[PDB]
Write a structure and sequence with these properties.
Chains A, D, E, H, I, J: GO terms for molecular function: diamine N-acetyltransferase activity; magnesium ion binding. Twelve copies of one chain form a homododecamer. Chain A has 169 residues and is of the alpha+beta class. Helix content of chain A is 31%, strand content 36%. In chain A, a hairpin with a 2-residue loop joins strand 6 and strand 7.
Amino acid sequence: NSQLTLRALERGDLRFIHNLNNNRNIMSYWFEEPYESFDELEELYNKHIHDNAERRFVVEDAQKNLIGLVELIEINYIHRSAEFQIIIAPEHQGKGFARTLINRALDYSFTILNLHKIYLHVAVENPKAVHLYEECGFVEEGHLVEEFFINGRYQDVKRMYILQSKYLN
Amino acid sequence: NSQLTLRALERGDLRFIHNLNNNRNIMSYWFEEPYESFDELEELYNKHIHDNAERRFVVEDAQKNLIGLVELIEINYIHRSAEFQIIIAPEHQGKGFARTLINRALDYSFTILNLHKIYLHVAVENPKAVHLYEECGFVEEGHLVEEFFINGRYQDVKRMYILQSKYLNR
Amino acid sequence: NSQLTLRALERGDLRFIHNLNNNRNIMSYWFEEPYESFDELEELYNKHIHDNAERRFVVEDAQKNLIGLVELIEINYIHRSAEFQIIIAPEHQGKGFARTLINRALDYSFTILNLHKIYLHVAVENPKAVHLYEECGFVEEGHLVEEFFINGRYQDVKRMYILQSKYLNR
Amino acid sequence: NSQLTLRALERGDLRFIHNLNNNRNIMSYWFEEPYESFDELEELYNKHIHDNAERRFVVEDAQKNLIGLVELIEINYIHRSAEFQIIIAPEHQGKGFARTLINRALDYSFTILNLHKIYLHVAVENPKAVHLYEECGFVEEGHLVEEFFINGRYQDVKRMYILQSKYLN
Amino acid sequence: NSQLTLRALERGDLRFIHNLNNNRNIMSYWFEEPYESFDELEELYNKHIHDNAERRFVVEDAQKNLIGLVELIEINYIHRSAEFQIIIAPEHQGKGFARTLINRALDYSFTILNLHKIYLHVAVENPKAVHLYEECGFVEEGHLVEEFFINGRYQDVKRMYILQSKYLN
Amino acid sequence: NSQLTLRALERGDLRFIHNLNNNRNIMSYWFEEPYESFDELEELYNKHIHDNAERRFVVEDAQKNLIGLVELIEINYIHRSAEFQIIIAPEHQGKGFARTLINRALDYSFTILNLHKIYLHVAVENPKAVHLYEECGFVEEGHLVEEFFINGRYQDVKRMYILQSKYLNR
Amino acid sequence: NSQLTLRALERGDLRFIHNLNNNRNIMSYWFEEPYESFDELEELYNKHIHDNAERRFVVEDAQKNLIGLVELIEINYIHRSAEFQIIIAPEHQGKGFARTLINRALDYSFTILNLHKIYLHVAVENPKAVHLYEECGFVEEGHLVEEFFINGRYQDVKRMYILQSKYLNR
Amino acid sequence: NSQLTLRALERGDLRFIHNLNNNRNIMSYWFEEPYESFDELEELYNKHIHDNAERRFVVEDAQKNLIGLVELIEINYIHRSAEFQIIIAPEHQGKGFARTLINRALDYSFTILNLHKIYLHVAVENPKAVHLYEECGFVEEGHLVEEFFINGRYQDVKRMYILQSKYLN
Amino acid sequence: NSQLTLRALERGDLRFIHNLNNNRNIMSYWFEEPYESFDELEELYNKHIHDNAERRFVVEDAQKNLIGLVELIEINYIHRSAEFQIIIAPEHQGKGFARTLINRALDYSFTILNLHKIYLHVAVENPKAVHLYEECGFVEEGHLVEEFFINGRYQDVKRMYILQSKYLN
Amino acid sequence: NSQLTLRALERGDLRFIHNLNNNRNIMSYWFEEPYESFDELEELYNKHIHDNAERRFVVEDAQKNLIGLVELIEINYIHRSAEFQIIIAPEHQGKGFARTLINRALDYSFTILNLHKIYLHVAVENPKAVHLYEECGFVEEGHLVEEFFINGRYQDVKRMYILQSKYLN
Amino acid sequence: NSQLTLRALERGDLRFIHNLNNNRNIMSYWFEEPYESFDELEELYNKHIHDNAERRFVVEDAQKNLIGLVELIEINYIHRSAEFQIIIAPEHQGKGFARTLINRALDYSFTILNLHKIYLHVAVENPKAVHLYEECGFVEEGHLVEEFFINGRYQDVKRMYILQSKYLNR
Amino acid sequence: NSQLTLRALERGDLRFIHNLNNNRNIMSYWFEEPYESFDELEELYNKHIHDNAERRFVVEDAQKNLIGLVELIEINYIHRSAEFQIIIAPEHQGKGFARTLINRALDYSFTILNLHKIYLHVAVENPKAVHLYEECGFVEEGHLVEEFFINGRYQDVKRMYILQSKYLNR
């Protein structure tokens, strides 16, 4: 149930993230190349530490087991928008967590960071991750055509958004 | 027209860019804040020197007028895409230059850089710029709702794109 | 009047800045020690170019005479507040310039930086700075008791503020 | 009671500071984003190591349990003024400890740092903390309108202060 | 069989890479001096950590025995071309493993890196490796005369290649 | 003719180099993007001075007009091979210069650097580069299928070579 | 006199200071060895740039004569004290300048810097300088026995001071 | 008895010094602020290592127990004077050591370092530490008025001196 | 017998080399001063790592015991010559290894590195190390007169050479 | 007897060197302040690591007890001259060891460093050390008046020397 | 002749050296590749600044002609030996300068540097240079077989030397 | 005479220094190799500014002609000794200058730096340097046998000295 908590990504967490980062089947849905030496990782972690344009979160339960990773990135502070990215680890999918976690990100985006808009990309051939975002109040503002090469072909993604005045009320 | 040339942006060009970069009715169109020390610009230009992820171009004519600037930014070499942007210096607009300028950018994109997709963002409330793009072959693929805060209001823009296939088989 | 504009602070402006920063009866109303090497200015200018939390502006008349300094400082992007501070050069005071430049500060804050609150500090013994701010919409939120030592004694300053919504719809 | 020591924050207090710097409830009262990786904290500590403009104090009891933090920040040596802030650890709340930590930081400010004015900022929605300050001699000098965005709303804050002659006479 | 994983080379694979980089017999087939102190390898690894122009893969089996190395080097993102090379460990030779490592690196090149052409260089004196490549779809495009000095004599090499449409159609 | 000489590439030659490196219909036959800041040239020149694996040469006529560029690159000292690449400035082509400068490349490679093999890459759609190399002794060792994207398409290049012994005793 | 001004020491002033710094009958009075490379002075000046613990001031008159130098050094912000020192260039002494100069230093000390105690060291054998100080309100608080080796002899000096209270209520 | 020895301050000694440095009741008599992170300490130790203008000594007995700290600072080599500072740790006061230690400092100053004058400051409200220095041949050359803010008020210190020609003979 | 192998000098090997480097009786025959701190060594090892003009080898047997050190230095790549240096450790002399090892160096020089000439220096009062080199196909091209001060006097060395075309065939 | 080895000073001899560098009695004979933190010694060692103008030797016996230090400093390679100094450890004094350490450093200077003159400086108040030097062949060439301040008085020193031809003939 | 002087090579001399360093029939004689950026030369000169193991000298006459260059390199201070090399600029040869120049080098070597043995390498096929050396007192000590690849052939050289004893007792 | 003064060594003095430092028959009596780049001078000057253990002085006549160099080196602040070394420019020797400048060395050492002993080294084959030192109070404390190689041989030098007390009361 609602035992799930969001926390700041830490150095101790990089092995878990290193694993997700090299998983082809997971990183495809973030349109990120599945190749990352732990060293390269450690370093880009060191980079993200002094960077106000991102916030990375590790998602845990009460055993303190790593359940997943929410990211808010490209925070832009004139326009007050950021890009949202979510992964739940293989052994923690299916359990109905995504709503909770996706909503905590929004709570974060809108009640703390005081952003106007969250947006995201997802593959049009993820027709059910799409149902999800829509259930959480996201809607499609874009159908981006052949945006990303994923698994041997150019694919379509939807861009989806939610604003602060919607989520608040 | 057939006399406009695109060349890599140089250090001797940074006063031209500074001015553009600090002008309110020009930066609005790129969604970029109109404020930049010549000292910030120069340093950014030196880190730009190092970036394979961008090509910033300056636009000249016959007798050396700097007419404008074209960029291909966020060039991604797996997905083979880049964002395109353009400026015609205030004193050079409304001469039918843009058309030729957008079309030099695509030919660069697609005949040298060998990209697959150029995309651009343009204000819904910039309907002249929208109609240019459409007449060069850009089609809308998204209606970004209230994406930018510009001149005191959150504003919608169109995402548009064109593919390498369509340009070469134009 | 309609002539007047703010632009980014440049390196060739530092002589004019330095002049003002060693002026006692000027520096006194910014609560600032009137002591600064041209060299400490240059380093501190190099420091604060990159500093996203600040914007410094020189004002120019139609003939590009340096008229004053407008600054928006401590800009926080979560709370969307920043502190405003201005100086008009001694030889340009008493012209009716003040409201125009305050208005430009607020324009930039609210239509470009998309801020929610702008605040300032003004000495309780500088009435007619206090009174110009009033006529631009600033209201007192606090009386800071004995806040700064200036000219041999601890003096009281007003904290005053204006919101985005009020500015943009009055 | 007199069983509370204040002392300089050391590297070994950082796990403790970190945990507090990621508690949203605690950090709310400080007008403060509840996100801080350990590495970022240790870089900030390494920095203020050399800021004569700031002092950070851990509170300890007799047995030397870590009760809290007290800070004097923005110390100004022309104007002789600094901002005071205090956290007590959730676990050590409500034992009538805070008045002692306050008179402690005041005594440091006035009897050692030879300061002239201490101010603080406290939520208008926290009339119990305001009460607290009033008992230790703090005088409201401002009511800042919508100064901070906290928890989805812009809120008001009391700025308050105390002077050296008042605390020492 | 499908029991072979490819993954990014990590710091803990370096003793293994080192041992291979000092085997003259193995390194002969790579046109390559068989001398490399560990420190020099770790400096080279530290370097390519940040070369988007190269990818290095260790091969693992189910039990996660280190079978070999596969590399895509000189990746060019205008021309969309890279050089392929493969080592299998002496101890894991001759178990019909190489065809799988090859189709593996091809699939990475073509399905993830979205490359256009892969080439390799193979000894004209190694008609068994050439055979190997031919079965996985590689076409001889050059016969380089006396290209490399190996073992006291200047020898010829086949340059061969495969294209994306061919591997994916 | 007998006038022509190669010498080390110098800093005061970079204007002439830069010119050539932003030339499209020149850069196309070196398989190289025609985009390069004067500043990226200068850094890359600073890079490659020390680089023992390369030698870059400017050619001069009897009057010290910059005639072209000769380069020997990837020089490996175990295998004793290097890649050769040349450019004659547009305003000096069609003079009969080509063989003299190829001959100088080979002279340097074989009598100074003591190389065993020199190879080049030439476009299969640049016949008369292919044919000049033949007359200097270069023979085809390979046909690289669809090797480079140039001018909107993947093109085939010839790999060609000449050995030390053949050069020095024919 | 009423025309002498104190300003922060600048880089353009370091030849004036160099000369003073190398003059035997001027440095004796500060107990400082008369030997300094312009190169040492400049570097010290750059580290001085960074020091909140000091204010070095230059003394001008109406028509830009550099008359001297005033320092407040070892400024301590808990104990709120600083050492004061002064020089009048040889050619400007005996004009009754010192008096005004010592009194600009104290007013700076006590009206801006908000210090509590200025102190100074002066040679027992400099009884003119002693009498100046006493007439500005400095009183002796110590007789330092043989503190400095100056001109071949260990020598006594007077420590003198004045407090903020006494200056403001002068 | 005269088992007490003076030695060079070392890195291993910094915990003992760290303790003395944060003791309000001890550092008041050196007019030094009682606040010092171990890190700041470590660093200023690293600084004092390449500094010919100071010598710091740890004072030990035969158990090798840390008994105290003598310092000679601002050694000035034209004028041949330095400032002397002494602390004996809390558990080692009362035992009559100060004379010994103060005299070893002088032996150091005058028989080794070849200084002409040692001077010191002490609070006029330390009327007995004053008797001490006087017993060791120090005399007052100054009564410095309101020099230091200590424990909530400006206080007077005496300056006291001894010369080489006196101590020798 | 021919169990002896040549390998790249490594960091783990520096204690063994440190020993040989400080041995007066060994280093005399290399005309190198017998004085070298392990630190200086470590550093000049770090130097030789990014240096294409040398190759240093540790010579081992099958116990993996360190038997000796072959060096090829001043590799010059226009002229295709290098200087050869050999030491067998004290407890491994007399066993008849030198021929093997000297020949592996040549194999290295001529079959791998593709050099035209190997040369060496040896003291004329080493009349038997000279017989050796001559047995391995080296001949004297020089008798260098009073070249080196060794053990209290200027001494003569022979320079000796072998070329690639000789050794090959 | 012949049971004394000289060798280069290593990092592990530093505790030993340090202890000697803080003995006032020992350091007196070297004209030398007896104060040196360990960190300062290790920085000085790290420095001279690269000074071809100096050589430092620990003395060891058979069992490898650390007997002392010997140094050749200020080696000048135009003039071929260096200064010699020797310490024996208090614990190893008076066993007729010093003559052997002296002829040892002379032999290094003359038979290895090919130097021309060695000099030393020895207290005029130490006629037993002077005796020592005279027996090993050192000739007084100066009587330096009040050259050093040691122990509260300015004292005289003998500068002495020996030449290469004299030591080797 | 008695008017030739040797002085340390300076930064103002590096164009003279550059030219020499890039000339084929001059570098052959030193066995050194004829190719060097002025930028490489300058940097080498700055690391040369630091080297006790070398002395590079420039050769002037009466009226400031730069006639040449002399080096003593690989100076070894235990073995007390150095390699000597020499160049006379093309336009200054065949004037009987060399003799005096070789003999200034030895006197430096042996009267100041206090070396024991100077040695040199010279091409067997440079028999004029061989005869110079022999007439100054150099005698052969080795016949280095095919040591250098020069002008397309591996070539033999003579190692020659002279000792301090023989020069001073000349 | 009374004209002559010593002042700190400055950067604009280095041409004059360099001149002297490459002079053989000058450098010989400082036991110093006459070889030094202007660039090694500049670095070594940058080195030794900060070096508290040395003071270098140029002497000037009444018209600011560089007359010579006076140095006090190895200044140790425990033992309070330093080594003295002087040069008068060749074109200013034989004027009777020597004692004045030695006297200035001692004045500075004893009345400013508060030294106890000043020593020098002088060649036993430079009598009249030996004799001028005598007349300034220097007495021999040692005869250094074969101390330096100079001009083809090992030569003997005198070590000579003068104490503070003797200088200051004779």
